[PDB]
Amino acid sequence: AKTHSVETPYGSVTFTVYGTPYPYRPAILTYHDVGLNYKSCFQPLFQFEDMQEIIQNFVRVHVDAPGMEEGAPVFPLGYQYPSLDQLADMIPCVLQYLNFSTIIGVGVGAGAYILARYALNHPDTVEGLVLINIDPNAKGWMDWAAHKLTGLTSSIPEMILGHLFSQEELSGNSELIQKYRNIITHAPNLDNIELYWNSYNNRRDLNFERGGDITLRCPVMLVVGDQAPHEDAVVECNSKLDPTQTSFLKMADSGGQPQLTQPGKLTEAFKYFLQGMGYMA
Amino acid sequence: AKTHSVETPYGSVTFTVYGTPYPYRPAILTYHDVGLNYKSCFQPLFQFEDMQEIIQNFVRVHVDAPGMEEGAPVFPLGYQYPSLDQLADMIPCVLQYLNFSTIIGVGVGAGAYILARYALNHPDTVEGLVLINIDPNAKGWMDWAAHKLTGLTSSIPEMILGHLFSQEELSGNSELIQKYRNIITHAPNLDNIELYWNSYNNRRDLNFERGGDITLRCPVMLVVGDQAPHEDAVVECNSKLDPTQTSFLKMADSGGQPQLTQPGKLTEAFKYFLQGMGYMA
Ligand SMILES: [Cl-]
Ligand SMILES: [Cl-]
């Protein structure tokens, strides 16, 4: 694995490349959720045994949001962190640096929004998208009021945790939940994480309409946990996208982070997703 | 199907496009043998029922050598016909005109030489090659002496026929042989065909060496008939190419033009060839 950084209009971004480029295939490019990094977000999936057998035949580029990279400095107080749209705009710089011309994007939560935005802006560079927990809607006033009321008695880590996991997972307090609670609550870059969180909260409508012009032009696999926080947004997202090109993997017993709890079934879905795109997997 | 022509440094070339471009796949591009056109060379294969089910998922560009296109004028006496290398050099113009960035080339005889030459010159545009009856060696003096001796008592059509079919096929005189004999002997563009024939005869070494630098960098399927005229050249070609990337389909009972006599088995080989490249077929 080789870690790189590239300069962009909005600051430096770090990414780690794994594997070897397969002739005339897209790179797999990932973007992680708020509170996480590529490792805490994607390691259980990309290191799953069945996944390793698929990804041998791809090069992989795992992006860390600015400030999330290993050994990131804490951005200065009052720093103007990139919006999600600006984050999406760092990806052309990444690909140009690597000389990769096309990708299959895999994103979770804010990372899914970013990869969707990227795909709208650069549709000829995107062969497919796996969009986990995607919520393409800006908060409306009712959302802002509820969020701010919640914020009065919840810490920043508790709120990020509530974005990642269901209330029931957070109450049940499994070993995975305990580990992720410590990760976020005691992160040395929590100030950086909070800026990314604010980004996410302030994102604009990703404005899919079934029947163009604002539509995704590529195969999409939508993923969400049954009864998880983002379920309604992913369901709604499924009704806006082109049905001939879109599959919806709504998983029972996966909770808020399906790529962490059910990497085996997700892997198998990815295999069929690649096959339906026309790649042997 | 849409027929197009493009201007090049060496004159106009015609080509017919079939099907619809499949996102992020190579176009299938064909180049026919001496004495034929894309139709007399490739129709039994590309219209084979099993083939139609594969090629639904590709756009196809069938090139007619200059002078072989429907309604071609007879080139003026003393015309300087393109060498095979110049013919190979017309292909960048074809692809640029269509805005296609990569191909899988399928060639027979002189068309296989041309597509191989093209691939050496533009390796990043070639995803794979099916090379039928390829003979990458210039004639040496012993070859020239034999050819010219043969020429004293054989007509131009008889010699072209002997390039396409085995002596045993030509003696046995099947219905296919009768049809192809009439096609060539009574072609209205025979003067054009003869110029292409002279091209072929005057070609230079395509200088494969097992271990680079002059080597094909892509999957290759070599095809020849058992005991057919080009058998030894294809066998020799197989020993120069990279074994990890090269498959050799030496067909029993196919004769001089395997794409005409065994399109079903050739189709099935093409399917596995695509699968080994990493495309579902
Ligand atoms: Cl990986
Ligand atoms: Cl066709």
Q: DSSP string spanning A64-107?
A: EPTT-STTPPPPPTT--PPPHHHHHTTHHHHHHHHT---EEEEE
User: For residues A49 and A77, what is the distance between their CA atoms, to the nearest angstrom?
Assistant: 43
* Total H helices, total E strands in chain A: 13, 8
The alpha carbon of A58 and the centre of ligand 1 are apart by a number of angstroms equal to 9
Q: Where are the beta strands (DSSP E) in B101-209?
A: 103-108, 126-132
User: For residues B174 and A98, what is the distance between their CA atoms, to the nearest angstrom?
Assistant: 57
Does the domain at B1-281 match CATH 3.40.50.1820? Answer given as yes
The alpha carbon of A119 and the centre of ligand 1 are apart by a number of angstroms equal to 21
| HSE (side-chain half, CA atoms, 13 Å) at A69 | 18
Q: Which method was it determined by?
A: X-ray
Task: Give resolution, Å, one decimal.
Answer: 2.2
Breaks in chain B after (C-N > 2.5 angstroms)? none
User: Measuring CA to CA, how many Å separate B84 from each of A82, A161, B211, B242?
Assistant: 55, 66, 25, 24
Q: Are A260 and A234 in contact (CB under 8 A)?
A: no
Residue A3: which H helix or E strand, with range? strand A2-8
Q: How many residues does chain A have?
A: 281
Torsion of the alpha carbons at A33, A38, A41 and A46, rounded to the nearest 10? 140
- Name the one residue in this structure whose structure tokens are 């970013």: A114
Q: Smallest Cβ distance to A278: which of B22, B102, B218?
A: B22
The total of other beta-carbon atoms located within 10 Å of residue B149's CB is 10
User: Measuring CA to CA, how many Å separate B52 from each of B48, B271, B278?
Assistant: 6, 11, 19
The total of other beta-carbon atoms located within 10 Å of residue B138's CB is 14
- Classify residue A234 as left (phi > 0), alpha (psi -120 to 50) or beta: alpha
User: For residues B60 and B16, what is the distance between their CA atoms, to the nearest angstrom?
Assistant: 8
Which candidate, A232, A273, A265, A248, places its Cα nearest to that of A105?
A273
Provide CB contacts within 8 A for B85, sequence distance 6+. B117, B203, B204
Locate A231 and state its tokens.
């379920």
Q: Are A170 and A161 in contact (CB under 8 A)?
A: yes
- Decide if A20 touches B, using CB distance below 8 A: no
- Name the one residue in this structure whose structure tokens are 């639904």: B56
Q: Smallest Cβ distance to A280: which of B57, B218, B279?
A: B279
Torsion of the alpha carbons at A247, A248, A254 and A260, rounded to the nearest 10? 40
- Decide if A100 touches B, using CB distance below 8 A: no
- Decide if A126 touches B, using CB distance below 8 A: no
- At B201 the three-state DSSP class reads helix
Q: List alpha helices for A122-253, DSSP H.
A: 141-151, 156-164, 167-172, 175-185, 190-201, 231-240
Provide CB contacts within 8 A for A166, sequence distance 6+. A225, A227, A228, A229, A255, A256
User: For residues A194 and A96, what is the distance between their CA atoms, to the nearest angstrom?
Assistant: 29
By C-alpha distance, the chain B residue nearest A101 is B24
Q: What's the order of all strands across the beta sheet hosting A2-8?
A: A2-8, A11-18, A60-64, A27-31, A103-108, A126-132, A220-225, A246-251
The alpha carbon of B30 and the centre of ligand 2 are apart by a number of angstroms equal to 10
Q: Are A253 and A226 in contact (CB under 8 A)?
A: yes
Q: Smallest Cβ distance to B278: which of A25, A102, A218?
A: A25
User: For residues A57 and B107, what is the distance between their CA atoms, to the nearest angstrom?
Assistant: 28
- Domain spans in chain B, listed from the N-terminal domain onward: 1-281
Locate B53 and state its tokens.
């089910």
Q: How many residues does chain B have?
A: 281
> A127 and B218 in contact by Cβ < 8 A?
no
Provide CB contacts within 8 A for A143, sequence distance 6+. none
User: For residues B209 and B136, what is the distance between their CA atoms, to the nearest angstrom?
Assistant: 12
The alpha carbon of B18 and the centre of ligand 2 are apart by a number of angstroms equal to 5
Locate A251 and state its tokens.
């998983």
